[PDB]
Structure formats: structure tokens, C-alpha cells
Design a protein around this ligand. Structure first.
Ligand code: HEA
Ligand code: HEA
Ligand SMILES: CCCCCCCCCCCCCCCC(=O)OC[C@H](COP(=O)([O-])OCC[N+](C)(C)C)OC(=O)CCCCCCCCCCCCCCC
Ligand SMILES: CCCCCCCCCCCCCCCC(=O)OC[C@H](COP(=O)(O)OCCN)OC(=O)CCCCCCCCCCCCCCC
Ligand SMILES: CCCCCCCCCCCCCCCC(=O)OC[C@H](COP(=O)(O)OCCN)OC(=O)CCCCCCCCCCCCCCC
Ligand SMILES: CCCCCCCCCCCCCCCC(=O)OC[C@H](COP(=O)(O)OCCN)OC(=O)CCCCCCCCCCCCCCC
Ligand SMILES: CCCCCCCCCCCCCCCC(=O)OC[C@H](COP(=O)(O)OCCN)OC(=O)CCCCCCCCCCCCCCC
Ligand SMILES: CCCCCCCCCCCCCCCC(=O)OC[C@H](COP(=O)(O)OCCN)OC(=O)CCCCCCCCCCCCCCC
Ligand SMILES: CCCCCCCCCCCCCCCC(=O)OC[C@H](COP(=O)(O)OCCN)OC(=O)CCCCCCCCCCCCCCC
Ligand SMILES: CCCCCCCCCCCCCCCC(=O)OC[C@H](COP(=O)(O)OCCN)OC(=O)CCCCCCCCCCCCCCC
Ligand SMILES: CCCCCCCCCCCCCCCC(=O)OC[C@H](COP(=O)(O)OCCN)OC(=O)CCCCCCCCCCCCCCC
Ligand SMILES: CCCCCCCCCCCCCCCC(=O)OC[C@H](COP(=O)(O)OCCN)OC(=O)CCCCCCCCCCCCCCC
Ligand SMILES: [Ca+2]
Ligand SMILES: [Cu+2]
Lengths: 102, 59, 534, 51, 133, 45
């Protein structure tokens, strides 16, 4: 398997637009986070807009939870939360730390 | 003579176990079972002497 | 009821009889090793009243029961007969009446070996039965005859079963499954069946010729008629080594399934695993005289067998690194089967590295009949093959039986045998390197130290076996309750990270073999319309 | 031949609905296994004159 | 869809009450929250949001862990109790064993060393036989 | 460029504690017979 990073985003962007129920959105999301890379910000945005279209809020919360496991530092987690600022605000998605604050 | 077809219909319409369906099977199975019992019991009736070291006096 | 279990032609029912007999025999062989370790606790006569023949008799009985009546009827007669037809889609085995005689000869071979120890004085010869110590001058009476007939009956069993395993794999696979698509456990019973087919007939020549010297006035091995004792050792060891691999490879295939399930990853380099299992099964026919390094063979004969023995370390080390590559980057689930598999990787490596030292003929001069050898082969047979037998039972018995077991009781059992096995066998290397011979009931006083330590660990490990006997009782009386309370593990695979709890209930099982897709106790008519794969 | 299916149906021994407790069968079976080496010792020590 | 919110008495602390709820009452909560998630998500209340997260990814049912809290401590206590019982049973069976050999004393072992020191035994690794009382 | 701290510092913080936990386990698995000899009569009288 010789797939460049640019080919990775353009293929999973196409794969999030075709998912037609909850099983499909969760199965595609599982395979996207199972490689040796963190998906690009433009892939995360299409995964949030796919869970809105099937009307499921917990799947959109878990997207950012997996993001904080896969990064290497906590400053890589921050820079994602600063790119996807409008989308998390426009759809009304909270963070798991914000929802169950400790 | 040829008796394959005739035995073919006797066998396929019988309720008994496989080794009992032939009309001649009583003559083999009755004496075999009696002989099979003697051939199993008798060696076992000798282990008591073998442990006790008693040898048969064929002399 | 009578005709379901005495007339059986079903491969699942026969596999249950095998396991029942296998576990009843490990009781006797463990009791003999406990009597042996009590008499070795201290210098002097301890419990056997100075009867050295009796001590030697119990050592033969210990080895024969553990090998030919526990590990072979359970790893092969049990798991092979139950899981091989289900993993390839077969409706039965080929030759179902052959499959039944290969079990019923083992009860008759036990009432031959047991009555051998009760007649005259028994057979105090070692499990290799070398002549002239085992001929009628040095062993009179019928004890060695009755032990040979017992070995003959286990050879009929393993040979007939091997012919059945080979035909079933080649002829009865299901739609779409080709030989490159077999599960790795099916490959391990298939290759083992070929080693048995090509090594058992040479052992039947050797021990039938020994029976002829004793009773028919023959000189195959008698020195007064021209015969040679060293011929017997060539014939015995040409079966022996292939046997040790007939005992580890089925465990290689079990370890592959367990490690992959509790990592959520497929086996790394699956195709090179079959090539390694075949290379080890082939090189196990070219190395047998490393067991005869000091009997006076030529120096050029000994230099060949050194290099032949060493190169079996290359394919085996490929399987060790391959197993560590599948658990790397995994999602590890530490259930009871996974604990044994991780201990197998650590304790089998140690036992195999002490074999590499033994492989050189120059160094084996200080390693002959030395406890050091006893330490080598209890690390690969008792922390090896035995640990893979526990891993198998905890992996498949809930499905096979429909009954769950107490999980936290099983983790206590694992730690008690891991601690106790190490205490028996680790100091055995210290005794051997300092020069303690094997097969002695009594020793000089300087060996008392480590011999006391090993006898303590023998009590720890027997207590762990008695806990396993209770776990079987609890599973059979309380197995249905173990599913509704929180005392057992229900799923060997948990939901994935982003997979919700209710989506997980659509497909509970994510398996790459058929067996976990059947009903819990599998149906007696398991396939009517054949299974199909792409 | 047709057999039954279920939980306690694929084993040769009875566990439920029996008069005597199943513990007498389970531990009696494994006791006899553990006890055959001691019967052998008794016979042979009674042959050497130790007893 | 059903627009009105679920009442506080219904979903106040879903995580703590979920395990004891009757099953038919669990199905009714799921049905009403499925119609509520079809609205824009900025309208939903916090107890409603915490309920939907808990039912999907909460540590229950399938997500039950291998060992319950307090199980590792039961395991460590059971292993240490198994070591004690086997060792104390060994010392009882030892008491039925045979007498000591006549040479296993410090007095006998010190004359052994007298003989070995003369013959120059083990000249760089030690020859002493003393291991007894 | 790269966001955050160097990968050496992040990996150093994770492995150093594990080196010491490895050497304290392998010493128990291989050195436990040394303790038996410590409390023996034969040792150091
Ligand atoms: C299968 C192989 C096997 C196994 C398991 C064992 C297990 C043990 N063996 Fe032995 N042993 C041999 C094979 C084996 N041995 C052989 C070939 C010889 C040489 C014979 C010769 O010299 O002639 C030998 C020799 C030998 C000697 C040498 C005596 C002398 O030279 O005279 C000693 C001495 O202590 C000894 C001890 C032990 C001990 C303490 C255990 C115990 O530690 C066992 C520990 C673990 C268990 C208690 C077993 C598990 C119990 C089961 C019933 C499994 C059930 C599992 C399921 C069904 C899931 N063994
Ligand atoms: C399960 C059973 C089993 C297994 C698997 C083995 C495996 C091996 N055995 Fe063993 N053996 C016995 C059972 C077994 N043996 C028994 C019962 C006896 C005594 C018989 C009797 O007298 O009664 C015996 C005795 C015996 C002898 C005879 C010694 C003597 O009697 O004096 C020799 C000789 O060389 C030997 C060597 C080996 C070697 C090299 C392996 C190799 O296969 C090991 C290879 C494995 C590894 C090497 C580990 C992992 C490897 C790597 C991680 C690769 C990297 C390594 C390097 C670069 C070195 N053993
Ligand atoms: C944290 C790291 C690991 C922590 C480490 C944990 C493990 C530590 C292990 C250290 C303990 C090792 C002790 C070894 C056992 C022992 O020393 O027994 C002492 C003696 C017998 O020892 P012996 O020298 O072999 O006897 C000689 C034989 N004669 C001559 C008597 C015939 O025995 C005697 O005769 C006198 C004692 C009699 C027995 C009573 C003692 C208590 C037993 C009670 C029974 C309870 C269980 C039995 C239930 C039926
Ligand atoms: C245990 C041996 C039973 C073998 C099966 C068998 O001996 O067969 C069982 C046969 C007949 O029963 P059947 O199966 O032929 O059916 C018959 C349907 N009409 O009775 C016997 O032989 C009796 C033999 C005496 C057994 C004593 C020796 C036991 C050892
Ligand atoms: C001590 C003196 C030595 C005695 C030798 C041991 C005697 C034990 C067996 C006694 C013979 C009874 C007949 C059973 C065989 C049979 O019937 O084979 C017939 C089987 C029946 O197949 P099926 O009914 O299972 O399937 C039902 C399909 N209709 O065809 C096959 O499998 C095909 C392959 C034939 C292979 C047969 C091998 C011969 C068995 C003996 C092997 C002994 C090896 C050790 C050599 C020393
Ligand atoms: C798969 C099948 C594997 C076949 C095994 C053949 C490999 C042989 C390699 C070692 C040969 C060697 O180099 O042997 C050298 C030794 C020399 O002995 P010496 O030191 O006493 O010479 C001193 C001279 N006075 O000859 C032997 O020992 C004989 C061994 C021959 C092997 C016979 C095998 C026959 C197989 C029959 C079983 C069929 C099943
Ligand atoms: C010198 C002796 C060395 C002995 C080492 C034995 C150690 C045993 C422990 C093995 C555990 C690690 C598993 C291997 C990791 C892996 O999975 O490697 C496979 C991955 C998969 O690459 P890919 O398929 O995605 O791309 C296609 C690749 N052709 O590539 C890597 O990661 C590269 C690993 C670095 C290479 C090793 C360098 C050693 C110096
Ligand atoms: C030695 C006996 C010592 C008594 C210990 C009592 C345990 C305390 C308890 O009652 O523990 C309760 C557990 C149930 O486990 P739980 O998780 O439900 O409770 C824990 C709540 N957190 O039952 C047991 O442990 C039973 C322990 C049995 C131990 C072995 C029994 C005898 C086996 C050998 C005999 C068989 C071999 C014979 C054949 C030769
Ligand atoms: C002694 C009692 C007599 C009571 C008197 C009768 C009065 C009425 C009482 C009702 C009881 C009827 C008694 C009938 C006999 C009976 O049910 O249990 C008696 C049976 C004996 O008989 P058996 O058929 O197993 O043959 C065997 C005779 N030698 O013990 C047992 O095997 C106990 C065995 C349990 C241990 C096996 C554990 C294995 C579990 C299966 C796991 C398989 C994994 C497979 C993986 C490949
Ligand atoms: C090893 C040296 C000493 C061995 C001999 C003594 C053994 C200790 C006695 C028993 C310990 C009981 C602890 C309780 C269980 C526990 O610890 O459970 C804690 C964790 C998880 O549970 P949790 O805490 O998350 O939840 C608790 C909820 N109640 O399980 C584990 O990590 C198990 C570790 C698995 C190890 C696999 C087998 C190890 C042997 C392989 C050799 C290792 C390699 C060697 C080279 C480095
Ligand atoms: C011998 C074979 C080994 C059997 C292991 C299981 C029993 C071990 C004792 C045990 O584990 O005792 C642990 C439990 C305490 O834990 P808990 O019940 O509060 O449960 C929650 C877990 N903390 O005390 C009991 O069970 C009652 C008394 C048991 C007897 C203790 C023996 C001590 C001497
Ligand atoms: C991987 C598995 C590891 C498990 C760990 C082992 C622990 C299990 C129990 C072991 C049994 C002990 C046998 C004692 C036999 C005896 O009686 O000892 C006798 C000796 C005296 O000698 P004596 O000549 O006076 O004897 C006279 C004979 N009648 O007294 C002792 O030394 C007491 C025991 C010392 C305790 C050490 C136990 C080991 C724990 C290791 C801890 C880590 C150490 C790390 C060091 C770097
Ligand atoms: Ca002794
Ligand atoms: Cu070998």
C-alpha cells in the first residue's frame, strides 16, 4: 500500500459523503483513525457534517476524543481546536471535558 | 447368480441395524457374541496369579 | 445413551471422550512426580524404604503418562478432532469408524501399563528402555513385555488418527477455501500428522525387535550373538526428536489464535508462519544423534550434527519475532488465555536457549545425564506445551460447553502455576552445572541445598492443579449463573473506540474463523447447506 | 442418528436432576486417578518385606 | 419529532440510575431522545446531552471491564493464601519422613574439610562442606 | 514546522520510568535464588 497523505484525505472525504446511516458513519470513522497518521482538518470537518446528517450527537463528541488520543503533544490538540472553531460552534458540538467537567 | 438388485431393496427398506438386515446374519452374530465373551473374561481371571507370582503347572 | 458413547461416529462426541481420558491421566502422572520429589527432598531413605527399583519404576510411569496419555490425547485427540472439522466446514471426519477405534485403544493401553507396575517388580528402565538393561537377563519376567504392548497400542492410536486428519484436510474443505486460506491451527494439525506418519513405523521396528530378543532367542542387540546395543538407540531416537516437535507445533497454532484475538490484530506475516512450521518439521528428521554425542561416534559425524541442530533455531526464532510483531501496536485485553500466551513467549525462549548450548558436541561432555538437561526439557514441555494447553481450554470451553467459568478464580490459578513451575525447574540448572547425575534416588550431601528448594515448589504447583479441578466443578454446576452475574467475561472482543454500545449488539462477534459463529454448544448437525467464502 | 441439543446434552455424565450430589462423581473420579500410584507402591513395598 | 424537552426527573443523573432501571422504561427514554436529536443541537439541555453520551459510550454492558473494582486485591490475597497453605502442608508431610543421614552434622562436616584441605581441594573456588547445625 | 515539544523529550518522559521497572522485574525472575542462599547456614556462617 503506497498511498500518499494527499491521496488519503481525498479518498476519505469521498467516503464520508456516501455514508447513509449510523452504521456506515461509525464504520468509516473507525477505519480512518486506524492508520499511522492523524487525519487532516479537512477530513475531521466532513466527519462532523456526516453525523449531523444522520442526527447523532455522541458520534460527533467522540470525534474530538479520538483526536486527543492520536496526536503526539497537547499543543497539537490545541491547534486542531483552533482550526475547527466555527464548525464546532455552528453545529453546537461540546467537548467531552466541557460536558463532564472535573 | 445376480442378487444385487434384490438385496438392494431388502436393505433399503429395513428398520434394523445395518449388521442385522441380511436374512443370514443371525447365524454369524449369535455364536460370535458368546465366543467374544470367553475371549475377554478368561485372560482377566489370571492377573490375580500374575501379581501373586503363581505359575501354571503344565508339568 | 449406550450407543451414543460406545458406538459413536460423531467427531465432537469422540473428542469429549479424549479429553476425559487425558485429564484422568494427568492426575496419575502428577501424583508420581510428587512421590518422586518427596524422595529427593533430603539425603537418605525418605519414604520408599530404600527400594531403588520402585523409585525407577515410578519414573518410567511418570514420563509415559505425561507424554502418551495426557499431552497427545488432549492437544491432538481432543482439540484436533473437535476444531479441525469445524474450522474447514466439514460435516464429519473422513473414516468415522477409524476415528472411534483410535480412542478405544488408549483405555486398553492403560490397563496394560498399570498392570505392568504391579507384576513382579515393574520396569525400572527409563522411558527410552535401553538394552541390555531391559533384556531378560537384567529384567526378568513379564513387566517389560506389558510396557511394550502398551506403547504398541498408543502407536496404533496416533497412526490411525493421523491418516484420518490428512484425508479430511485435503478432501473436505468448504466452498472457496483453498490451502492458502486455512486457519493457522488447521495447518498445525496437518503438518503434525505427517511427522507421525513417517516416524512411528521406525519405533515399531525397534521395540518389536527388543521383544524378540527377550522371548524368541534373537540377537539384534545382544552382544554374545553379534548384535549391537547402539543400533537400538539409533532406531529409538530417529522417532524421539520428531516426537518433541509432534508435541510443540499444535501449541504453536493455538498460540497464534489467542494472541491475534486479544490484540485485535491479524497475525504478522501469516504466510511465513506456515513456511516456518514446515521447515521445523523437516529439519526435525536430520538431527537425532545429538542424543548420542558421547557413545563413541566419529568426530566428523559429530560436527555434522552440531550444525544441523543449530540451524533449527532460525525458523523457530522467526515465529518468536512474528508473535511479538502482532502484539506491537495492538489493543491488548488481559483475559486468562492471554496471560498464558505471554508467559509462553517468555518461558519457551528460556528453554530453547539452553538447548542451543546443548547443541554443540564439545560442550555436551559437561551436559550428559546432568540435571541441566532435565531443566531444559521441563521449560519447553511444562512451561511450554502445558501452558498452551491451559490457554486452549480457557479459550474454547465456554463455546464448546455453553457454560462460563469464574474469571478471578482463574487468574489465581495462573499465578500459582507460574510461580510454582519456576521454583521446581530453575535450580535444576545449578545442580547440573555442578555435576549432579540424573535418574538417582540418592545423592551426595553437597546437593541437598537446591534439592530442598525444588521440592517445595512441587507442592505449590500441585495446589494450583487442585484449584483447576474445582474451577471445572464450578463451571459445570454454576455455568449458567456465571453469565448473569459479573463473575465471568462474556465477550473476548470489546467494542471499538467509536463504536457505540447498541451498534455493537448488531454484530457481537468479529471472527476470522467459523467456530465462534456457531451456537454456543454447537449443533449435532452443524452444516446442511455448505458454508461459502470468497 | 438424531440426538438432542442444549447445554448438558453433549457430555456422557449427568449433572442435574440426579439423586446423589454431582460432587461425589466429580471428585471421586479425579480421586481415583490421583490414587493409582499409591496402590502400586503398596503392592511393591509389601513384596520387599518392608511392611 | 417530539419537541418538548425530557423532564429533569427523567434524566437527572442517567449514569447512576441506568443500571437499575426497568427495561421497558429504558426503551421509552431512548425513543424520546432519538426524536430530540433531530433538532439543532444548540437547543438540547445538559442532562439530555449527558444521557445520549452515556448510553452510547458508557462503561456498562458490552463495555464492562475484565476485572471489577476490588478484584486485583482479591487476586493478590488469593495468591498469598495459596503460597502459605502449600508451604505449611509440605512441613507436615516432612514430619512423616525418615530420619536424617548420620553425616548431616557440623561435627562430621568439619572433619571432611580437614581431609580436603590436605589434598588441596578446589584451590580457587572453595571446598567447604559445612551446611548443617 | 513542528508543533509542540521535541519528540525526544516526549519519548524520554515515557521510557525512563519503564527501564527501571524492567530491571526490577527481571532481577526478581533471575535473582530470587540468591535470597534463599542469603538466609542459609552454609552462607558466611
Ligand atoms: C509431558 C511432559 C512432562 C511433564 C508435564 C512433566 C512434569 C513434571 N516433571 Fe517430569 N519428566 C518428563 C516429562 C514431563 N514432566 C520426562 C520425559 C522425564 C524423563 C524420564 C526419564 O528420566 O526417564 C521427566 C523426568 C522428571 C524428573 C527426573 C527423575 C529422575 O531422573 O529419576 C523429575 C524430577 O523431579 C521430574 C519432575 C516433574 C515435575 C515436578 C513436574 C511438575 O512440575 C508438573 C507441573 C505442572 C503440572 C502439575 C501439570 C499440569 C496438569 C495437568 C493434568 C494438565 C491439565 C490441563 C488441561 C487439561 C487444560 N520429571
Ligand atoms: C517440547 C519438547 C522439546 C522442544 C521444543 C525441544 C527443543 C530443542 N532441544 Fe530438546 N529435549 C527434549 C524436549 C524438547 N526439546 C527432551 C524431552 C529431552 C531429553 C530426552 C531424554 O533424554 O529423555 C531433550 C534433550 C535435548 C538434547 C539432548 C541433550 C542430552 O540428552 O544430552 C539436545 C541436544 O542438542 C536438545 C536441544 C534442543 C534444541 C536446540 C531445541 C531447539 O528447537 C530450540 C530452539 C528455540 C530457540 C532457540 C528459542 C527462540 C529463538 C530465538 C529467539 C532466535 C534467536 C536465537 C539465537 C540467535 C541463538 N534438547
Ligand atoms: C514476599 C516474598 C515471598 C515470601 C516467602 C514465602 C515463602 C517462605 C518459605 C519459608 C518457609 C520454609 C520452611 C520449610 C519447611 C520446614 O522447614 O519444616 C520444618 C520441619 C520439617 O523440616 P525437615 O528438616 O525437612 O524435617 C526433618 C524430617 N524429620 C527428621 C523430621 C523426619 O517441620 C517440623 O517438623 C516442625 C514444624 C511442624 C509443622 C508446624 C508448622 C506450621 C504448619 C501448620 C500446618 C498448617 C497447614 C497444614 C494444614 C493441615
Ligand atoms: C463393552 C463391550 C460391548 C461391545 C459391543 C457389543 O458387544 O455389542 C452388544 C451385543 C448386542 O448388541 P448390538 O449392538 O449388536 O445390537 C443388538 C440390537 N438387537 O451384545 C453382546 O455382545 C453381549 C456380549 C457380552 C459382553 C461381555 C464382555 C464385556 C467386555
Ligand atoms: C498386533 C498385531 C497388529 C494388528 C494391527 C492392529 C489391528 C487394528 C485394526 C484391526 C483391523 C480392523 C479393520 C479396521 C481397518 C478398516 O476397517 O479400514 C477400512 C476403512 C473403513 O473406513 P470407515 O469405516 O472408517 O468409513 C466408512 C467408509 N465406508 O477404510 C479406510 O479407512 C480407507 C483407508 C484404509 C486404511 C486402513 C488401514 C488398515 C488398519 C490397520 C492399521 C494398523 C497400523 C499399524 C500396523 C502394525
Ligand atoms: C526425512 C528422512 C530423513 C532421512 C535421514 C537421512 C539423513 C542422514 C544425515 C546424517 C547421515 C550421517 O552423516 O551419518 C553418519 C554416520 C556415521 O556413523 P559413525 O560415526 O559411527 O562412522 C564411523 C565409521 N566406522 O552414519 C550413521 O550414523 C548411519 C545413519 C544413516 C541414516 C539412515 C536413515 C535411514 C532412514 C530409514 C527410515 C525411513 C523412514
Ligand atoms: C537486527 C535484528 C532485529 C531483530 C528485531 C526483533 C524484534 C522483535 C520485536 C518485533 C516488534 C516490532 C514489530 C515490527 C514493526 C513493524 O510492524 O514493521 C513493519 C512496518 C510496516 O510497514 P508498512 O507495511 O506500513 O509499509 C511497507 C513497508 N515495507 O514497517 C515499519 O514499521 C518499519 C520498521 C523499521 C525497520 C526495522 C529497523 C531495525 C533497525
Ligand atoms: C483450601 C480451602 C480454603 C477455604 C477458602 C475459602 C474461600 C473463601 C470464599 O468463600 O471465596 C468465595 C469463592 C467464590 O468467589 P467469588 O468471586 O464469588 O467471591 C469473592 C467476592 N469478591 O469461592 C471459592 O473461592 C472456593 C475456593 C475453593 C478452593 C479450593 C477448594 C478445594 C480444591 C481442592 C480439592 C479438589 C481436589 C480433589 C481431587 C483430588
Ligand atoms: C457414582 C454415582 C452413582 C449414583 C448411583 C445412581 C443413583 C442415581 C444418581 C444419578 C446419577 C447417575 C450416575 C451416572 C453416572 C454419572 O452421572 O456420573 C458419573 C460419572 C462417571 O460416569 P461416565 O458416564 O462419565 O463414564 C466414566 C466412567 N469411567 O462421573 C464422571 O465422569 C465425572 C467426570 C467429570 C470430569 C470431566 C470434566 C470434563 C468436562 C468436559 C469438558 C470437555 C472439553 C472438551 C474440549 C475438547
Ligand atoms: C513477575 C515477577 C513476580 C512474579 C511472581 C509473583 C507474581 C505476583 C503475584 C500475583 C500478582 C497479583 C496482581 C493482581 C493482578 C493485577 O496486577 O492486575 C493489575 C493489571 C490490570 O488490572 P487493573 O489494576 O487495571 O484493575 C484492577 C481491577 N480490580 O493486571 C496486570 O497487569 C496483569 C499483568 C499480565 C502479565 C502477563 C503474565 C506475566 C508473566 C510473563 C513474564 C513477564 C516478562 C518478564 C520479563 C520482564
Ligand atoms: C487455597 C487455594 C486458593 C484459593 C484462593 C481463593 C480464597 C483465598 C482467600 C481470599 O481470597 O480471601 C479474600 C476475601 C476478601 O475479599 P472479599 O470477599 O471482601 O471480596 C472483595 C475483594 N477484596 O476474603 C474471603 O473470601 C473470606 C475469607 C477467606 C479465607 C481467607 C484465607 C486467609 C488465610
Ligand atoms: C519467578 C518466580 C519467583 C518466585 C519467588 C520465590 C518465592 C516462592 C517461595 C520460594 C520457596 C523458598 C524455599 C526455601 C527453602 C528453605 O527451607 O530455605 C532454607 C533457608 C535456610 O537454609 P538451611 O540450610 O538452613 O535449610 C535448612 C533445611 N531444613 O531459609 C531461607 O532461606 C528462608 C527463605 C528466604 C526467602 C526468600 C524467598 C525468595 C523470595 C525472592 C524475593 C526477591 C529476591 C530478589 C533478590 C535480588
Ligand atoms: Ca533421598
Ligand atoms: Cu532432540
Amino acid at each position: 500500500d503506497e498511498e500518499t497523505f494527499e491521496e488519503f484525505t481525498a479518498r476519505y472525504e469521498k467516503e464520508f459523503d456516501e455514508a447513509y446511516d449510523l452504521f456506515e458513519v461509525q464504520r468509516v470513522l473507525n477505519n480512518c483513525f486506524s492508520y499511522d497518521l492523524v487525519p487532516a482538518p479537512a477530513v475531521i470537518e466532513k466527519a462532523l457534517r456526516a453525523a449531523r446528517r444522520v442526527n447523532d450527537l455522541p458520534t460527533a463528541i467522540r470525534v474530538f476524543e479520538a483526536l486527543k488520543y492520536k496526536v503526539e503533544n497537547e499543543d497539537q490538540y490545541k491547534a486542531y481546536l483552533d482550526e475547527l472553531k466555527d464548525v464546532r460552534q455552528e453545529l453546537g458540538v461540546p467537548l467531552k471535558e466541557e460536558l463532564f467537567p472535573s | 447368480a445376480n442378487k444385487v438388485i434384490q438385496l438392494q431393496k431388502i436393505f433399503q427398506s429395513s428398520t434394523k441395524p445395518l449388521w442385522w438386515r441380511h436374512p443370514r446374519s443371525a447365524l454369524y452374530l449369535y455364536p460370535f457374541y458368546a465366543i467374544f465373551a470367553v475371549a475377554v473374561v478368561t485372560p482377566l481371571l489370571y492377573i490375580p496369579n500374575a501379581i501373586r507370582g503363581i505359575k501354571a503347572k503344565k508339568a | 445413551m449406550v450407543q451414543r458413547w460406545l458406538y459413536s461416529t460423531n467427531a465432537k462426541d469422540i473428542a469429549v471422550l479424549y479429553f476425559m481420558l487425558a485429564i484422568f491421566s494427568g492426575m496419575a502422572g502428577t501424583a508420581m512426580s510428587l512421590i518422586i520429589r518427596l524422595e529427593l527432598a533430603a539425603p537418605g531413605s525418605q519414604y520408599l524404604h530404600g527400594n531403588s527399583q520402585l523409585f525407577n519404576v515410578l519414573v518410567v510411569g511418570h514420563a509415559v503418562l505425561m507424554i502418551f496419555f495426557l499431552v497427545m490425547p488432549a492437544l491432538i485427540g481432543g482439540f484436533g478432532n473437535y476444531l479441525l472439522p469445524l474450522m474447514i466446514g466439514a460435516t464429519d471426519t473422513a473414516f468415522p469408524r477409524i476415528n472411534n477405534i483410535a480412542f478405544w485403544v488408549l483405555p486398553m493401553g492403560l490397563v496394560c501399563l498399570v498392570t505392568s507396575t504391579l507384576v513382579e517388580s515393574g520396569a525400572g528402565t527409563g522411558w527410552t528402555v535401553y538394552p541390555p538393561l531391559s533384556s531378560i537377563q537384567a529384567h526378568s519376567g513379564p513387566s517389560v513385555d506389558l510396557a511394550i504392548f502398551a506403547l504398541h497400542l498408543t502407536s496404533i492410536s496416533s497412526l490411525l488418527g493421523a491418516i484420518n486428519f490428512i484425508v479430511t484436510t485435503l478432501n473436505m474443505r468448504t466452498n472457496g477455501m483453498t490451502m492458502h486460506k486455512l486457519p493457522l491451527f488447521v495447518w498445525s494439525i496437518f503438518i503434525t500428522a505427517f511427522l507421525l506418519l513417517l516416524s512411528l513405523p521406525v519405533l515399531s521396528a525397534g521395540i518389536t525387535m527388543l521383544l524378540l530378543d527377550r522371548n524368541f532367542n534373537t540377537s539384534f542387540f545382544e552382544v554374545s550373538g553379534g548384535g549391537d546395543p547402539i543400533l537400538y538407540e539409533h532406531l529409538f531416537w530417529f522417532f524421539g526428536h520428531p516426537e518433541v516437535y509432534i508435541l510443540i507445533i499444535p501449541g504453536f497454532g493455538i498460540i497464534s489464535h489467542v494472541v491475534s484475538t486479544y490484540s485485535k490484530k491479524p497475525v504478522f506475516g501469516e504466510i511465513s508462519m506456515v513456511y516456518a512450521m514446515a521447515s521445523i518439521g523437516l529439519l526435525g528428521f536430520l538431527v537425532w544423534s545429538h542424543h548420542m554425542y558421547i557413545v563413541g561416534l566419529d568426530a566428523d559425524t559429530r560436527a555434522y550434527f552440531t550444525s544441523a541442530t543449530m540451524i533449527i533455531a532460525i525458523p523457530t526464532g522467526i515465529k518468536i519475532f512474528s508473535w511479538l510483531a502482532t502484539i506491537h501496536g495492538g489493543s491488548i485485553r488481559l483475559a486468562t488465555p492471554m496471560l498464558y500466551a505471554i508467559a509462553f513467549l517468555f518461558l519457551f525462549t528460556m528453554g530453547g536457549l539452553t538447548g542451543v548450548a546443548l547443541a554443540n558436541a564439545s560442550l555436551d561432555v559437561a551436559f550428559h545425564d546432568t540435571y541441566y538437561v532435565v531443566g531444559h526439557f521441563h521449560y519447553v514441555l511444562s512451561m511450554g506445551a502445558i501452558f498452551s494447553l491451559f490457554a486452549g481450554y480457557y479459550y474454547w470451553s465456554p463455546q464448546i460447553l455453553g457454560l462460563n467459568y469464574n474469571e478471578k478464580l482463574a487468574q489465581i490459578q495462573f499465578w500459582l502455576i507460574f510461580i510454582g513451575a519456576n521454583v521446581i525447574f530453575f535450580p535444576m540448572h545449578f545442580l547440573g552445572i555442578n555435576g549432579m547425575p540424573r535418574r538417582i534416588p540418592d545423592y551426595p550431601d553437597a546437593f541437598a541445598g537446591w534439592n530442598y528448594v525444588a521440592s517445595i515448589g512441587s507442592f505449590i504447583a500441585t495446589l494450583s492443579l487442585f484449584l483447576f479441578i474445582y474451577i471445572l466443578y464450578d463451571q459445570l454446576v454454576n455455568g449458567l449463573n456465571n453469565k448473569v452475574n459479573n463473575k465471568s467475561v462474556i465477550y473476548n472482543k470489546a467494542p471499538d473506540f467509536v463504536e457505540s454500545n447498541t451498534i455493537f449488539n448488531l454484530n457481537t462477534v468479529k471472527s476470522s474463523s467459523i467456530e465462534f459463529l456457531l451456537t454456543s454448544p454447537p449443533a449435532v448437525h452443524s452444516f446442511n447447506t455448505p458454508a461459502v467464502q470468497s | 442418528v438424531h440426538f438432542k441439543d442444549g447445554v448438558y446434552e453433549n457430555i456422557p455424565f449427568k449433572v442435574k436432576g440426579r439423586k446423589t450430589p454431582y460432587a461425589l462423581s466429580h471428585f471421586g473420579f479425579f480421586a481415583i486417578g490421583f490414587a493409582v500410584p499409591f496402590v502400586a507402591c503398596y503392592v511393591q513395598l509389601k513384596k520387599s518385606g518392608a511392611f | 419529532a417530539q419537541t418538548h424537552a425530557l423532564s429533569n426527573a427523567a434524566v437527572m443523573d442517567l449514569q447512576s440510575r441506568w443500571e437499575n432501571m426497568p427495561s421497558t422504561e429504558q426503551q421509552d427514554i431512548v425513543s424520546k431522545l432519538s426524536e430530540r436529536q433531530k433538532l439543532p443541537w444548540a437547543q438540547l439541555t445538559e442532562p439530555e446531552k449527558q444521557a445520549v453520551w452515556y448510553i452510547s459510550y458508557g462503561e456498562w454492558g458490552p463495555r464492562r471491564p475484565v476485572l471489577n473494582k476490588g478484584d486485583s486485591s482479591f487476586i493478590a490475597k488469593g495468591v498469598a493464601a495459596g503460597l502459605l497453605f502449600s508451604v505449611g502442608l509440605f512441613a507436615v508431610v516432612r514430619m512423616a519422613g525418615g530420619q536424617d543421614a548420620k553425616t548431616m552434622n557440623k561435627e562430621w562436616q568439619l572433619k571432611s574439610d580437614e581431609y580436603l584441605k590436605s589434598k588441596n581441594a578446589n584451590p580457587w573456588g572453595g571446598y567447604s562442606q559445612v551446611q548443617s547445625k | 514546522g513542528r508543533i509542540g515539544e521535541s519528540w525526544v523529550i516526549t519519548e524520554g518522559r515515557r521510557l525512563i520510568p519503564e527501564i527501571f521497572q524492567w530491571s526490577a522485574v527481571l532481577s526478581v525472575c533471575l535473582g530470587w535464588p540468591g535470597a534463599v542462599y542469603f538466609f542459609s547456614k552454609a552462607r558466611k556462617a
